[PDB]
Amino acid sequence: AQNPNCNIMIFHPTKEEFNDFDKYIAYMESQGAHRAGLAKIIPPKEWKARETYDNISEILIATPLQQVASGRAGVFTQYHKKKKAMTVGEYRHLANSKKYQTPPHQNFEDLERKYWKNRIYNSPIYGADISGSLFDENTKQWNLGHLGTIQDLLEKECGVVIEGVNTPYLYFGMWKTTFAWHTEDMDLYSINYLHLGEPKTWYVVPPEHGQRLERLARELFPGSSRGCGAFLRHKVALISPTVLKENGIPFNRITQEAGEFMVTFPYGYHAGFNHGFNCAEAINFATPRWIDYGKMASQCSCGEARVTFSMDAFVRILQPERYDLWKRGQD
Numbered sequence: 001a002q003n004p005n006c007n008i009m010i011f012h013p014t015k016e017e018f019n020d021f022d023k024y025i026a027y028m029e030s031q032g033a034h035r036a037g038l039a040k041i042i043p044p045k046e047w048k049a050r051e052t053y054d055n056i057s058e059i060l061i062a063t064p065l066q067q068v069a070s071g072r073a074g075v076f077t078q079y080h081k082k083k084k085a086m087t088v089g090e091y092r093h094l095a096n097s098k099k100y101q102t103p104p105h106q107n108f109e110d111l112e113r114k115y116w117k118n119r120i121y122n123s124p125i126y127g128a129d130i131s132g133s134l135f136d137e138n139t140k141q142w143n144l145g146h147l148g149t150i151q152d153l154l155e156k157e158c159g160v161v162i163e164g165v166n167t168p169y170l171y172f173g174m175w176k177t178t179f180a181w182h183t184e185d186m187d188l189y190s191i192n193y194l195h196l197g198e199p200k201t202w203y204v205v206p207p208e209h210g211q212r213l214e215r216l217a218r219e220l221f222p223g224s225s226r227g228c229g230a231f232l233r234h235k236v237a238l239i240s241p242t243v244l245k246e247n248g249i250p251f252n253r254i255t256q257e258a259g260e261f262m263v264t265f266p267y268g269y270h271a272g273f274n275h276g277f278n279c280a281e282a283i284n285f286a287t288p289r290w291i292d293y294g295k296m297a298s299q300c301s302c303g304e305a306r307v308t309f310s311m312d313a314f315v316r317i318l319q320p321e322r323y324d325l326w327k328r329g330q331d
């Protein structure tokens with residue numbers, strides 16, 4: 001069995017190996033990358049996502065989200081307070097302001113310590129989930145706006161034609177902006193490219209151990225757990241590495257830098273934070289190996305998780321017994 005300790009693997013594809021996306025995902029899996037839940041892919045030196053980032057300041061962040069925390073430093077939830085619209089240029093200025101800028105630090109490890117110590121005492125503002133792409137149309141390799149769609153994958157594998165579309169999203173971050181512990185919708189893969197700026201630290205639980213994380217989370221968030229049998233789908237709960245280690249939960253951590261891709265694998269729980277002003281792009285995707293995960297994915301039916309249009313068909317076809325209850329939670 002490859003990668004039996006479920007370590008995060010890092011890949012350096014050549015330009016030739018960078019041509020066929022599906023083939024390279026399958027290669028990484030052949031080497032056990034998926035056992036970690038997360039892999040890093042460093043693009044060949046010849047590749048670029050686009051020529052420059054000099055002309056992105058006029059992008060609009062229609063609903064910046066202030067991430068307000070409640071709890072204790074290692075175990076907290078966050079809610080998102082909507083803020084007035086602002087451009088990327090306005091948001092970058094804000095991120096670099098004395099109130100929000102990254103503090104002086106020695107290295108990533110020092111910064112990680114400061115994050116876990118101090119995050120709850122601040123409310124950083126995140127430009128998340130903005131539909132769009134920063135890949136140049138002429139970038140032919142690993143262009144996250146030109147991937148094969150999940151609808152087409154389900155059709156190829158299962159023969160059923162469904163409605164829905166699959167497009168990427170931009171994330172503009174700042175120091176302490178936080179992504180809560182989650183798996184993807186329908187336990188899909190995700191791919192994330194850090195276009196520019198400061199790093200993103202990730203934490204991940206191996207898919208084979210995901211239920212250990214869920215059990216801890218039910219313990220640590222007992223009201224939320226009573227509210228919903230899949231409350232991590234709400235994407236609001238944070239647990240620190242110290243707390244995970246205290247409770248024996250297997251996990252790994254890595255920092256993504258600008259110019260690097262990360263792939264999350266089906267049912268790989270992940271969480272993390274940004275080091276300073278940055279811009280990432282991400283999208284969900286599927287492969288044939290995902291289908292069995294999609295069929296087994298938990299679902300939130302309490303009303304909180306509310307998701308895209310395109311999840312309807314996935315539920316309806318892969319999880320017909322759950323469909324009626326899930327759809328009630330959508331409505």
Ligand SMILES: O=C(O)CNC(=O)C(=O)O
Nearest residue numbers: 171179190191192280282
């Ligand atoms: O970058 C972020 O804020 C969150 N990204 C992801 O959860 C992802 O790419 O799957």
Ligand SMILES: [Mg+2]
Nearest residue numbers: 056057058059
């Ligand atoms: Mg612009």
Ligand code: NI
Nearest residue numbers: 183184190270
């Ligand atoms: Ni994710």
Ligand SMILES: [Zn+2]
Nearest residue numbers: 228300302304
């Ligand atoms: Zn719920």
